[PDB]
């Protein structure tokens, strides 16, 4: 049903999206650094939230990441960071 998919990725669109990703990572880098926290860690976070909660692995490898607790902790932190950051 990948036809229900909108492969309407005109060049202009593909493009746009592209940069929007790199930048996204570059950011993560700043972050981790501007935080002393692991980058992978970060994006891992970034995901869950964007990946919605109806999708959170009920078993993050069985408690690996405290999907419901250690998570927000980070959020309010980042959120509690200056605009620039």
């Amino acid at each position: 049903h990948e036809i229900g998919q909108v492969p309407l990725l005109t060049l202009e669109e593909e493009v746009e999206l592209a940069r929007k990703v790199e930048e996204g990572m570059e950011a993560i880098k700043k972050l981790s650094e501007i935080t002393g926290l692991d980058p992978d860690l970060i994006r891992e976070v970034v995901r869950a939230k964007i990946l919605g909660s109806a999708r959170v692995r009920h078993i993050p490898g069985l408690k690996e990441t405290l999907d419901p607790k250690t998570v927000e902790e980070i959020d309010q932190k980042l959120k509690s960071l200056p605009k620039e950051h």
Binding site: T10, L11, E12, V15, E16
Partner: protein, 226 residues
């Protein structure tokens, strides 16, 4: 949106069922208009300055209760006088104007404007500084309605009152946004001398702000409603 098609981006304020979008674009699916992919964007740059003139001397021919879009001098047989400071003629444009720049040398040597009524002979006006520009002040010499004005400085000594006042006007413009470009600026946001507006891959020749610029976007690739 086809190319050049666009109607309600400055109305991304709201959207309704069957909301009219583009000649051939509809919107039953309610919500709010959203900007998507620009291509064309106007840029008005406010332009202010000062000028020195020569009008009806020993007579009142202008009242303060006047603004942008009225008369100046009127039916004086015949205004054709001798000025005495030339340069490099350069006539500017208006919806009703031809202003003269006098680049004698590199410096701003002289400033002269001619509202509807005064005929600006281009390069004619420079040999032995005789007010050679034989402009003809006759009748209703009105002013373009596009630029406000005030603070007149009339000086009585002979035939024509040398005036000086405030010249405030805006001036629309436009530029294309290619697929790789990106507006940094939002909804008609203000712009300054050194404030980069839009960019793209080529650091070379990308949207560079200037003297008081304002935002207006006109050519999207699409629109979102939600």
């Amino acid at each position: 949106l086809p190319p050049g098609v666009d109607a309600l981006v400055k109305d991304g304020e709201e959207v309704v069922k069957g909301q009219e979008l583009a000649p051939g674009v509809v919107s039953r699916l309610d919500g709010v208009a959203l900007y998507r992919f620009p291509r064309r964007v106007r840029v008005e740059y406010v332009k202010k300055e000062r000028a020195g003139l020569r009008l009806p001397l020993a007579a009142w021919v202008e009242k303060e209760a006047y603004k942008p879009g009225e008369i100046l001098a009127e039916l004086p047989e015949p205004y054709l006088f001798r000025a005495e400071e030339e340069g490099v003629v350069e006539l500017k444009e208006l919806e009703e104007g031809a202003f003269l720049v006098l680049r004698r040398e590199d410096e701003p040597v002289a400033t002269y404007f001619l509202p509807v009524g005064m005929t600006p002979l281009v390069v004619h006006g420079e040999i032995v500084e005789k007010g050679q520009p034989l402009a003809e002040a006759k009748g209703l010499l009105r002013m373009p309605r596009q630029v406000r004005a005030a603070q007149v400085e009339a000086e009585e000594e002979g035939e024509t009152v040398y005036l000086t006042l405030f010249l405030e006007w805006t001036e629309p413009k436009d530029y294309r946004v290619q697929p790789h470009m990106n507006v940094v600026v939002p909804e008609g946001a203000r712009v300054e001398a050194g404030d980069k507006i839009v960019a793209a891959i080529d650091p070379e020749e990308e949207v560079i702000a200037e003297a008081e610029g304002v935002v207006h976007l006109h050519e999207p690739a699409s629109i979102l409603v939600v």
